[PDB]
Design a protein around this ligand. Structure first.
Ligand SMILES: C=CCn1c(=O)c2cnc(Nc3ccc(N4CCN(C)CC4)cc3)nc2n1-c1cccc([C@H](C)O)n1
Ligand SMILES: [Cl-]
Length: 259
């Protein structure tokens, strides 16, 4: 087995319908990697589509400091294995949970740094004519601080996109409406709600009234003291008109975030 041969398994760091992820050290180089191991999807299935979106995302993107680096992918014993960068900080989602417990927080300065850094990653993805389509805390990973976009299984072309809808909680209305003429702006919407989660918002709605209230352009209630100017920024990032939301490039060059 290549997996056993090339790597020694240290720790299971994730599990779910995606299978399992393991912290592994690669024998040859002594470095740490996160390796996803899953059953090879049934041919013709959503799972196979998602897996192909991921393979061909790596084929296009190469390497960037706000994107989780992809190293290799193979199949064996009817399983597939994906070897990625190990981000020693876990996901933003884990860090938010930890904050909700110890009890610490992301204040304004930290939130702005998160917006900029993930924004840089988006900027790069979009310039390669791709969109991520599943931005959320559990898909943002931390190295220690560097924030990096991972989990590329929903990535698709700005056109023609094969749209597998992301998490309903972070999903823009126009995507739900089968309008895919400005998909980059859906990544922007999701990022803003991602930053709102980091700022300590209650769990985001999956549907019903408050869900629609957000797509009407209204920020979920936050628990802390944010500037009117940072607020306005997040507000326009979920503007019902995706053309009014800033592009990634407009985002990374904004006075509020700069530095
Ligand atoms: C390879 C697949 C995707 N993936 C990365 O690319 C990737 C990069 N870095 C890391 N670092 C990392 C993550 C979690 C932890 N924990 C340590 C303590 N635990 C009890 C809690 C968690 C420590 C370090 N994890 C990553 N991936 C990963 C890990 C888990 C679950 C999922 C799902 C698919 O979203 N993905
Ligand atoms: Cl666009």
């Amino acid at each position: 087995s290549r997996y056993t041969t090339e790597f020694h398994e240290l720790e299971k760091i994730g599990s779910g319908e995606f299978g399992s992820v393991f912290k592994c050290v690669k024998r040859l180089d002594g470095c740490i990697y996160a390796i996803k191991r899953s059953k090879k999807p049934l041919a013709g299935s959503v799972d196979e589509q998602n897996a192909l979106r991921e393979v061909y995302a790596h084929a296009v993107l190469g390497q960037h400091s706000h994107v989780v680096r992809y190293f290799s992918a193979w199949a064996e014993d009817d399983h597939m294995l994906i070897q990625n960068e190990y981000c020693n900080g876990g996901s933003l989602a884990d860090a938010i949970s930890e904050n909700y417990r110890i009890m610490s927080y992301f204040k304004e300065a930290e939130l702005k740094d998160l917006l900029l850094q993930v924004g840089r990653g988006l900027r790069y993805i979009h310039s390669m004519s791709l969109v991520h389509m599943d931005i959320k805390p559990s898909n943002i990973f931390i190295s220690r601080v560097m924030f990096k976009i991972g989990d590329l299984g929903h990535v698709t072309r700005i056109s023609s996109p094969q749209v597998e809808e992301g998490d309903s909680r972070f999903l823009a209305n126009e995507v739900l409406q089968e309008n895919y003429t400005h998909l980059p702006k859906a990544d922007i919407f999701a990022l803003a709600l991602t930053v709102v989660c980091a700022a300590g918002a209650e769990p985001l709605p999956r549907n019903g009234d408050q869900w629609h209230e957000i797509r009407q352009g209204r920020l979920p209630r936050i628990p802390q003291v944010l500037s009117q100017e940072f607020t306005e920024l997040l507000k326009v990032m979920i503007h019902p008109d995706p053309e009014r939301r800033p592009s990634a490039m407009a985002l990374v060059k904004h006075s509020v975030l700069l530095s």
